[PDB]
Paper text:
Aleutian mink disease virus (AMDV), a pathogen in minks, and [name] (PARV4), infecting humans, are parvoviruses belonging to the genera Amdoparvovirus and Tetraparvovirus, respectively. Despite low amino acid sequence identities (10–30%) both viruses share the icosahedral nature of parvovirus capsids, with 60 viral proteins (VPs) assembling the capsid via two-, three-, and five-fold symmetry VP-related interactions, but display major structural variabilities in the surface loops when the capsid structures are superposed onto other parvoviruses. The viral capsids are critical components of the viral infectious life cycle: they protect the viral genome, are the determinants of the tissue type and host that is targeted (tropism), and remain intact while the virus escapes the endo-/lysosomal pathway and trafficks to the nucleus where the genome is released, leading to viral genome replication. The VP monomers of PARV4 and AMDV conserve the β-barrel core motif (βB–βI) with the additional βA strand and the α-helix A (αA) observed in other parvoviruses.
This results in very small depressions at the two-fold axes and more segmented depressions surrounding the five-fold channel. While most viruses of the Parvovirinae subfamily possess three separated protrusions surrounding the three-fold symmetry axis, in PARV4, density near the three-fold axis fuses the three-fold protrusions in the shape of a concaved triangle. Structural order in the density map of the PARV4 VP started at lysine 15 (VP2 numbering). The PARV4 capsid utilizes VR-II to form the five-fold channel; VR-I, VR-III, and VR-IX for the two-/five-fold wall; and VR-IV, VR-V, and VR-VIII for the three-fold protrusions. The fused three-fold protrusions are caused by VR-VIII with its subloop leading towards the three-fold symmetry axis.
Numbering used by the authors:
A (entry chain M), C (entry chain c): 15 to 552
B (entry chain b): 222 to 442
D (entry chain b): 15 to 111
The structure:
C-alpha cells in the first residue's frame, strides 16, 4: 500500500504538513577524499574532507514543510510554533538502467536493482544536517529532488609550513565507511519509513513581535522614586537627578538588552570590502575563521528613511549578517557558474522592520564628558584607555533578548555540538532549533551492480552498471503550535507586511513569461518572509 | 575523550551553502554578498560560537621582563591587584608543533595565566633547597594539550584589515581612536559552546562552590 | 526480508563482527585438470591438480572480520580471543546476462538465472580453506569480491623417469564432481545462510605479551640452594658452584624453552639465496619440500640496533620466516605480472619486538671447553662428532613456549589433517586455530544455461549463455573474548606500538593522491599489526 | 577488625580505588594568628589568617586515588568519569611519646 501523501492540517494544538516528491539517486563515485590546502595570503584553510558514495536527505527548512499559504495561515492564527515530529518515507522505488550505446542512451527498468537506506539513531557518523547548505526539495512540486551526496570534514595536524598551510593528517583523520553498518536493502515495490520525534524540551519560538520598547515600560505619569547620579559638581557635590516617568532614555531599568556587536551597517560606503565580517582567530595576518551571526541581532534592519516617508526605505545590512540565496526555480541554462567566488546578487535579506525588543544600537557607553579622570590621559603608558565606544556590548547577569525570528527559509533544527558545557545552545544563531538528538541523517545509496567479471585478465574492474533510482520521498513534519491570544486592545493591529516581489507580481506564484514563453518563472519575495506577525506585550 | 571535529568545520564539503554572508559594500551601497562553498571552513557562517577566550600571549613576548601578575581584576592604578589566573577554560599550555622538518622537540607555548603543577620531591633527602626564594620553580608539569581542542588556539575577536570602520573611524568624540579591531577577552555570547579543561592526572578532584547567591557554570572549576 | 548486515559489537563475553560485500560469480569452465610436471633441476614437483566449475568463499583471516579500529579495540580492552562462531549468508542474488554484440557488450538481468550453493558438513571434498592463499574480501568495502574458483591437488604414482619427475596417475587419482551432491538451487530473491560453530575445545589465544624472561623468575636476593657442576678440576675434584639469585643465565631452571631452529637471520649478507629455507626431503639434489615455519618462533625480530638508539631498527628476517603479501587495493593497471617467479617487494613482515618468552637464541650447547673428551678428536672415524653447535634445539619433556601471536592478517582457522595421531595440532605454525571440523567450504556456481540445441547437426554444443551472478555476501563471525585482567603494578604500561606506514600517513585510511588524482590509495602498515598489546606475568 | 585496604577495581559501571598510608600527627601549637601586612609597592595584600592546633586530611587529587596504571586503564577502556563517593578511615592509631 503506497499512497501519495500531501496537504497540511491545522489544528488548535498541532500543525501537520506533508509533502511527496519524486527523488533521484545519482550514482556517486566510491569514497573519495577532497584535500584542499589552505593559504595564509588568502583566507583558505586546509580541509581533509571525505566524499561518500552515500547520499542523504536534507529536509531541513521551514520552506520545505510549509506551503507559502500554509506559512501565511501559520502566522495569522497562531503563535509559538515548536516542532513536534518528523517522518520520512521512501516509497515507489524504481531503478532505471542507463545503457549508453552508439545508438544513444536508452533507460530501461531494472527489475533487479536496489537501494540501501539506513538512518543514524546513534549519531555515530558525522552529522551534516543543519549547517544551511543548499540541498533541499525545490519549492516547486514537479522539480525533481536529486539527493545530495554525503561527505564530511575531518582535521589532521595543521601546520604552517610556508605562506600556504597544509594538513599532514598524522592524527585525528577519520574514515567512515557507511558500507559497514546495518542498512535495509530496498527494491522495486518496497516501502521504508523512519518516524522521529523532537525532544519535548524544545523552546516555544514566538511568532509575534514584542509590543513595548524594553526600556520604556512604566507609568508616564509618576516621577521615579530613584535618583540616578548624573555627575559630580562643586568638587564632591555628586548631584542627583530624579527622572520623570516620561523620560525613557534616562530611567534606570531592571533588565538590560541582550548582547550586541554594534557593527556598521552601510555606514561604511567605501568600496573596500571586509575579507571576513567577524573572525575569532589568532594570526595577525596568518589566518582567521568567521563567526558571522555572532549574536542574535537583526541581520538587516528596515530603518525607514525620512524623505517625506520615502517609498523605498534604505535597508541596512549589518556586516556579519546573513541572507538566504535565491535558488533557481526550474531555471534552465541560467546556471551562470562563470560568476566565481560565489558573488550573489539580490539574496533574501531577512529584513526586520525594527519592531525589535530594543532599537538598533551601537555604543556601550557613548558619552561626551571629556576625560574619565581614571586613566584619563592614558593608563600606565602612551595607550589612551577605556575608550568610550566599546564594541561587543557583553551579556550581563540581568539581561533580556529575543533570538532571531523564523524566516520562511529558516532552517528548522541543528545539532548542538556534542560538548561538555554549552550556553543557550537551544537557540542557534543562524536558525530555528538547536537539538541534542536531531533528526537522523538518512543515508541512501544505489545497491551497486558491478560489470561482467574478467577472467582475471586485465585486473581492472569493469565500471558499475550505470543506473539511477527514482522514488517518492514522503516527508511529513508535525509542529506544536498555540493559537494567538490577542492582546486585548481597542485598535485594529496592522498585520505584518505582505511579501513583495521585485517583479511586483504576487509572491510564490508562477508568472507566465519573464522575457521567455518557454517556462514559467516561480516568484519569491524580494526579502525573506519573517514569521513575526502581531504585537504582544512584553 | 577528545572532540573529533573542529567546531567551525562540520558540514558537507560537497554542497555550497544556501546562505550569503555580506562580505562588504561596493560601488556605494551595492553591499556585495558571497555564497560560501562547503569547503570554505573559515568563511562559513556558523550556528555556535566558541567559548570565551583571553587571547593571551604565549611565548610571543621573548622579553626578559616578567608580568608581576598575569591577569588581575583590581582597581588600583599601581596600588593593588589580585590575580584571576586561569580566568577561562583554555589550554594552559599548547603543544603547537614546530615546523622545522617536523622538529622532534616541539615548542611548547605556555599561556600567561596558565598554571602548572609543581613536581613534589619524592622521598628526596636534603634537596629541600629552600634557599631558592620567592618560589621560583623549575620544570613543573605543564598540562600541555596537543591542540586536539574543540577550536584551535586563537587570539583576536575581530582581526580584520579593512582600514577605518567608518563609524568612529578616526576617533569617537575625542582624540581616543576607538573600536580597535583587536579586542582582548572574547566574551561569552548566548549561542556558545566550549569544553572545560581536561583532567590532568594531578587535577584536583573537587572544590567547594563558594556559598553565594548566584553562580554561573560553577560546577566546572 | 533481506537486510544489509554490518558493524561490530563488543561485549565483555563475546565479539560479534559482521560484513556484507557485493560478490560476483564468474562463469568458470568445466572441470579441467591442471597437470604440471616436476623437474629435479628446479624444485618443481609433479601435481595432478583439478579445476572445478564451482567456486567457494574463503572468509578466513582476522583482517576480514575485524575492522582495523575493531582490531584496535580488541587489543586495548581484551585478552584471550577465541573464535566462537561463523555465519555466512548469500542474499540479494541477481544474475546478469552478458550479450556480446558487434554493437557491444550489453548486460541485462536474467529473470531465469540461478546459482547453486551447498556446504560440506561432511568434509567429503578436499578441504581447501586455511592454506593462506589469496582469496579474500578486499579491505575496502566497495571492492567487489569475486569468488575464487575451486580446485584440488591429487597425487598419482610419482616416478623419477629422467631429470624431470612426472606423475603417471595410475593410482590415488580422484575426481570429485561437486555436481553430484545435494545443493540448493537459488535464484533472484532467494536467501541462503549457513550458520557454523567452532568447537568449544579451541584454546584461548592470548593477546598479551609475557612479562618475564623465562629463565629469570626468582628472588634476586637469595642464593640458590642448588649447586651446578661447573666442571672438573684437579683430576676428579668436580668443582661445584652455587649460583646467586642475580645470576640469570647460570641458574638451573625447571622449564626449558620450546623448540627452536636457530636459523640465520640477515647474518648471511651473501647475495646467494636459499633455494628453499627448510626442507625435509631425501634427495641429495633430486628433490625437497619446504617446512617453512617449522617451529613457533618470531618470523622476524625487531632487534633494536645500537647506534645511539638508531631511529630505524634493523629488522632481522629469519629464513623460513613468512610475510603477508600486501594486496593491491583497488589498484588499476599496477598488476605488473611482468615480475615473475613471484618476487614480492615490501611484504608485511610480522615483526615481533622481542617481548618474547625467551630472547632470540641459536646454539643448543655453545661452549668453549675444548674437546668433550668423549668422542674428542673423533668418534670411530675421521668424523669429528658431537659438535657443540646443534641446530634445531629439540622439544624435551619439561618445556614451555608460546605460539606465534595473532597478526591482523593471520588466518583464523585451518583443518587439522585427518590423521591417526597429531601433536599440538591445535596451534598451526602459520596461523590462528587448528580445528578438527572447520567451517565448511561453501561451494557456489552459476546454474548453467546451455545455448540453443542443434538439430543433431554439427555435434558441438553451443557454449553456455555468458552470464554472471552478483550478490550480497553476509559473513558474521563471533569471537569469545576475556577482558584483560591488568597486572597490578604501579607503572603505566607502554602500549603496543601503533602501526606505521612507509608513507608516514595514518594507517588503514584513504590517502588522496599518490602521484595520481584518480583513485585514493588505501594505506596499510609497513609491518604486520601484532595482536600482542600489554604485558602479563608468566 | 582492622584490615589494610588497597587496590582498585574496575567495573563497567564504577571504579573503586583504595589506598592506605601510615600517617602522622605532629603536635601543632595552640591557636596562633598569622598577620602579614600588605604593601602596595609589592603585590602583598594584608591577611589576618589563623593557625589551628587541628590538622586535616586533604586527599583531593586524582593522582592520590588512581595509581598511574589505574589511571592508564581509566582512559583506555572508559570515558566520562564522574566521582561517586569518598570514604576515609583512620585506623591502627598508635601514639608515641
Amino acid at each position: 500500500k503506497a499512497q501519495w501523501i500531501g496537504g497540511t492540517s491545522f489544528s488548535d494544538s498541532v500543525v501537520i504538513t506533508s509533502h511527496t516528491r519524486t527523488s533521484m539517486l545519482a550514482d556517486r563515485g566510491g569514497y573519495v577524499p577532497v584535500y584542499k590546502q589552505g593559504s595564509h595570503v588568502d583566507s583558505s584553510q586546509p580541509v581533509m574532507g571525505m566524499k561518500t558514495p552515500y547520499s542523504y536527505i536534507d529536509v531541513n527548512a521551514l520552506s520545505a514543510h510549509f506551503t507559502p499559504r500554509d506559512f501565511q495561515q501559520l502566522l495569522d492564527e497562531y503563535d509559538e510554533i515548536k516542532p513536534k515530529s518528523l517522518t520520512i518515507a521512501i516509497s515507489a522505488i524504481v531503478i532505471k538502467d542507463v545503457a549508453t550505446n552508439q545508438t544513444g542512451t536508452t533507460v530501461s527498468d531494472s527489475a533487479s536493482g536496489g537501494i540501501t537506506v539506513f538512518a543514524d539513531d546513534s549519531y555515530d557518523y558525522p552529522y551534516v544536517l543543519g549547517h544551511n547548505q543548499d540541498t533541499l526539495p525545490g519549492h516547486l512540486p514537479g522539480e525533481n529532488y536529486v539527493l545530495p551526496q554525503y561527505g564530511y570534514i575531518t582535521r589532521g595536524r595543521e601546520i604552517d609550513q610556508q605562506n600556504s598551510i597544509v594538513a599532514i593528517s598524522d592524527h585525528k583523520t577519520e574514515l567512515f565507511f557507511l558500507e559497514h553498518h546495518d542498512a535495509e536493502c530496498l527494491g522495486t515495490g518496497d516501502h521504508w519509513s523512519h518516524h522521529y520525534e523532537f525532544p519535548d524540551d524544545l523552546p516555544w519560538r514566538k511568532l509575534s513581535t514584542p509590543n513595548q520598547t524594553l526600556y520604556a515600560r512604566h507609568n508616564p505619569i509618576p516621577s521615579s522614586r530613584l535618583a540616578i547620579m548624573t555627575g559630580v559638581d562643586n568638587d564632591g557635590t555628586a548631584i542627583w537627578k530624579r527622572p520623570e516617568g516620561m523620560d525613557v532614555g534616562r530611567l534606570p531599568l531592571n533588565y538590560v538588552p541582550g548582547p550586541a556587536l554594534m557593527m556598521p551597517t552601510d555606514t561604511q560606503i567605501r568600496n573596500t570590502t571586509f575579507r571576513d565580517p567577524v573572525a575569532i582567530g589568532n594570526p595577525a595576518t596568518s589566518d582567521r575563521y568567521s563567526v558571522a551571526p555572532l549574536v542574535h541581532q537583526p541581520w538587516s534592519v528596515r530603518t525607514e528613511e525620512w524623505l517625506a516617508n520615502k517609498t523605498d526605505y534604505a535597508v541596512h545590512n549589518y556586516l556579519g549578517g546573513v541572507a538566504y540565496t535565491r535558488r533557481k526555480h526550474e531555471e534552465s541554462y541560467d546556471k551562470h557558474e562563470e560568476d566565481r567566488d560565489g558573488r550573489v546578487t539580490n539574496p533574501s535579506r531577512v529584513v526586520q522592520i525594527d519592531g525589535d525588543l530594543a532599537a538598533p544600537h551601537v555604543g556601550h557607553t557613548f558619552f561626551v564628558p571629556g576625560h574619565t579622570r581614571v586613566t584619563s590621559g592614558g593608563t600606565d603608558t602612551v595607550y589612551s584607555p577605556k575608550l568610550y565606544q566599546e564594541p561587543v556590548f557583553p551579556l550581563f547577569p540581568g539581561a533580556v533578548w529575543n533570538p532571531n525570528p523564523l524566516s520562511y527559509d529558516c532552517q528548522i533544527w541543528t545539532k548542538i555540538p556534542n560538548t561538555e558545557c554549552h550556553f543557550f545552545a537551544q537557540y542557534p544563531l543562524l536558525g530555528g532549533w538547536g537539538v541534542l538528538t536531531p533528526p537522523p541523517m538518512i543515508f541512501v545509496k544505489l545497491r551497486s551492480q558491478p560489470g561482467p567479471p574478467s577472467p582475471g585478465a586485465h585486473t581492472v574492474p569493469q565500471s558499475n552498471l550505470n543506473q539511477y533510482a527514482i522514488f517518492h520521498l514522503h516527508y511529513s513534519m508535525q509542529f506544536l503550535v498555540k493559537r494567538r491570544k490577542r492582546s486585548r486592545r481597542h485598535n485594529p493591529e496592522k498585520p505584518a507586511p505582505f511579501p513583495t516581489t521585485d517583479s511586483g507580481r504576487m509572491p510564490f506564484t508562477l508568472a507566465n513569461s519573464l522575457k521567455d514563453p518557454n517556462t514559467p518563472v516561480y516568484e519569491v519575495p524580494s526579502d525573506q518572509w519573517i514569521a513575526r506577525n502581531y504585537s504582544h506585550l512584553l
